[PDB]
Design a protein around this ligand. Structure first.
Ligand SMILES: Nc1ncnc2c1ncn2[C@@H]1O[C@H](COP(=O)(O)OP(=O)(O)O)[C@@H](O)[C@H]1O
Ligand SMILES: Nc1ncnc2c1ncn2[C@@H]1O[C@H](COP(=O)(O)OP(=O)(O)O)[C@@H](O)[C@H]1O
Ligand SMILES: [Mg+2]
Ligand SMILES: [Mg+2]
Lengths: 375, 69, 69, 375
């Protein structure tokens, strides 16, 4: 299927795995990060004895399979799910073995050392891979953006990373990760919908309402004013049609769901909102480059697909920062895949072909030394 | 004879049901895409009005700064 | 009994055919609306890009004028 | 009958209504939450034309009246039953009108807004009441316990609420309700008794076996070991005498009925057992206060009248949590009425007499504004 000896770019982002060959502009195999295990034991004869579903095979059946998240906040919980999702991506979709081409994986900023050593060991010992490389997502996203300056805000599913890069210079001391993202928003919407009257307590419905949020939920331009005008609703409340057919009616809750990002007090945490944390990060940077960080801020992550984030960011930053300079916020189209796109354009360089880590040196050095070599 | 006719009619019924389900799936996909595109159009119209207001502000500011110069 | 069942099956077949035709019509309508919305959003993307370039030029000249002042 | 202008404390708990005047230590009018409606139509002349039985009048006759539960999982199904049970409690037992004293009602945590607005409207418009107040059960139970710290586990009839309160501080974000309680236990016992051989499919027998459970069923200290030793039964199986006279023989099933609480998989639900859900709730709290929540856990609800719950909780929490600290579980005597008792001691304070909601402000504001004022 592939006639070019190039690394397979597999972005294992929290919530959605995006795998594809280098050189492509979009991932071909896109599936959620979920593992469906058989809950009961059947006396039936003939069905697949497979004890571990994955991807679309699990999405197609969520009532029988108990759903487990292979990644939580960033820390890898179960490694069997890791081996399952890579083995599946290798021998069920791509139809190619890892013994013929490299593999450029993308990991989140500020992750545990155990996670890195574990994935590297599974990719070297178990699977025979000629060479591995771990890369931070923020750099590849800035590559795909086509710039060298700005602060990347990557909001995945269970973690949110703010990474400032000015003139192509990383700042490992300022990268601050906060576990507020799509899962805590799904939980907030679920508890407020339970407050509305429709109560559910199973994961399949949680994924359904997550999809409903992805499709409908947006960000408000003025929270309190929308609350007042929605008190007497007319066009502000919408009636959604569940894929099963049950008629759901959702009004203001939509534009109050992502608001939890701006007010973490809703989930009883002393952490500051994403905008205030980004602002504090800007103060932690130097003054000289602060204006450039204001003018080149970039966004990444699937959570940014909601309509109305750019305007909300502009008003909040204008209210926090002075209103004398110019603070333009740029969001490139299809930003979610941009990271992966970067991977593709990063795997075609010959120099990058010279910066890989082969098996033998890793085996003698050991995983810890490999950690030192990368950084 | 009537059993053969009923068998044929039931086969045609199954075919029509399959075609109707396929058409309903396509209708869902198309309506979702249309609604998403309409929402994007509305949001971007708001955006471009805001940007035009900003451009007018910048032009007036420039004219004032020029006069002062 | 078989004649009654055949009559019922034929009625169901006619109803399914009518539903399929209506679904195809709504499919055509939704596809037309989606195509129009995509054309509109593309035109608005070019317009907003042009206005953004204009605004960047305007703000660059405003900064130059402020420095001169 | 009453010479003090004090609020009537009416705990409308799921399964048992407990009504009484403030200042008393126990409810005087205690009757199950059931409504009996005439099933057939009689040509007889002279009997009461009353078309809606309630309370003991329905309990005395369960063969003729089809029984309907006025509350399910927490959501109010029928409002006519609500009006029936309050009108009955007012003009058949207490022998007092609501137009002379307030009324402090107790509602379950995390209930629908429709339920609250409906009951408040029936208590203001229809009935002329000088003032109403909705109160959460967990706070009043913690009051009656005589403390300010701990996690209250209220297991009613169709819903189970875990509510953490440390230093008197409520945590509306951590309150998680799960619809596993006495009704699902009655259903499990019924299906397993149908498996034993005695099959029934009517509600009167369901209430009878519910009473049998309340009287006999207990919690096991070691499930598998009791299963093994009960395989060869001697004193482990007991012969109960039905109030009708039929000789029932029940062995291990007793201590396997409440076990469904610890293993929701028996009812095919992905939800976690009450102990595991409480443990997860403790992780959701902060670490600083977790030890105090371990040392001050409180229980509430009629379902807690079974013998052996405290020990089972201690072993399960010790197996789940470390065994280095001290984890004492306290269960106050007569905990079931404690909630109501709290109401009594809450209605005697002058400040609480200042926190009531009169008719006029509610009428101008409307019910929704009243919801904002309370919380
Ligand atoms: N099309 C979409 N619309 C809205 N939200 C989305 C969409 N796709 C993904 N998300 C949200 O983004 C999160 C996953 O993001 P992720 O795939 O990790 O981004 P990235 O791959 O850029 O790191 C989930 O919480 C999900 O709710
Ligand atoms: N004396 C008792 N012994 C055992 N179980 C009981 C007893 N009284 C009530 N229950 C159980 O408790 C449930 C009702 O509890 P409820 O009256 O709502 O408690 P509370 O009034 O504290 O909320 C029913 O399922 C019933 O089976
Ligand atoms: Mg992301
Ligand atoms: Mg209770």
């Amino acid at each position: 299927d592939e006639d070019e000896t190039t690394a397979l770019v597999c972005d294992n982002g929290s919530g959605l795995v995006k795998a594809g060959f280098a050189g492509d502009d979009a991932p071909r195999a896109v599936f959620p990060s979920i593992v469906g295990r058989p809950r009961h034991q059947g006396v039936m004869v003939g069905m697949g004895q497979k004890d571990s579903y994955v991807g679309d095979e699990a999405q197609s059946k969520r009532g029988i399979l108990t759903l487990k998240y292979p990644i939580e906040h960033g820390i890898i919980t179960n490694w069997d799910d890791m081996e399952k999702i890579w083995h599946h991506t290798f021998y069920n979709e791509l139809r190619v073995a890892p013994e013929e081409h490299p593999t450029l994986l993308t990991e989140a900023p500020l992750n545990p050392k155990a996670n890195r050593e574990k994935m590297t060991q599974i990719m070297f010992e178990t699977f025979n891979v000629p060479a591995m490389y771990v890369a931070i997502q923020a750099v590849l996203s800035l590559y795909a953006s086509g710039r060298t300056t700005g602060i990347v805000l990557d909001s995945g599913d269970g973690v949110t990373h703010n990474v400032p890069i000015y003139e192509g210079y990383a700042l490992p001391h300022a990268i601050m990760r906060l576990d507020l993202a799509g899962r805590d928003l799904t939980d907030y919407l679920m508890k407020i919908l339970t407050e509305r009257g429709y109560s559910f307590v199973t994961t399949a419905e949680r994924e359904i309402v997550r999809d409903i949020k992805e499709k409908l939920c947006y960000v408000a331009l003025d929270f309190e004013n929308e609350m007042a005008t929605a008190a007497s609703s007319s066009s502000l409340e919408k009636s959604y049609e569940l894929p099963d057919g049950q008629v759901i009616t959702i009004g203001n809750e939509r534009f109050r769901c992502p608001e939890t990002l701006f007010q973490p007090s809703f989930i009883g945490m002393e952490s500051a909102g994403i905008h205030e944390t980004t602002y504090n990060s800007i103060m932690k940077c130097d003054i000289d480059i602060r204006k450039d960080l204001y003018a080149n801020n970039v966004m990444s992550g699937g959570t940014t697909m909601y309509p109305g984030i750019a305007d909300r960011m502009q008003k909040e930053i204008t209210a926090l920062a002075p209103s004398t300079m110019k603070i333009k916020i740029i969001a490139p189209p299809e930003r979610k895949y941009s990271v992966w796109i970067g991977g593709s354009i990063l795997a075609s360089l010959s120099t990058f072909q010279q910066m890989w880590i082969t098996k033998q040196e890793y085996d003698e050095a050991g995983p810890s030394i490999v950690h030192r070599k990368c950084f | 004879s009537l059993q053969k006719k009923l068998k044929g009619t039931e086969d045609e019924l199954d075919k029509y049901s399959e075609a109707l389900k396929d058409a309903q799936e396509k209708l869902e996909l198309a309506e979702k895409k249309a609604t998403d595109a309409e929402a994007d159009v509305a949001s971007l119209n708001r955006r471009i009005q805001l940007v035009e207001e900003e451009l007018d502000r910048a032009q007036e500011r420039l004219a004032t700064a020029l006069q002062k110069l």
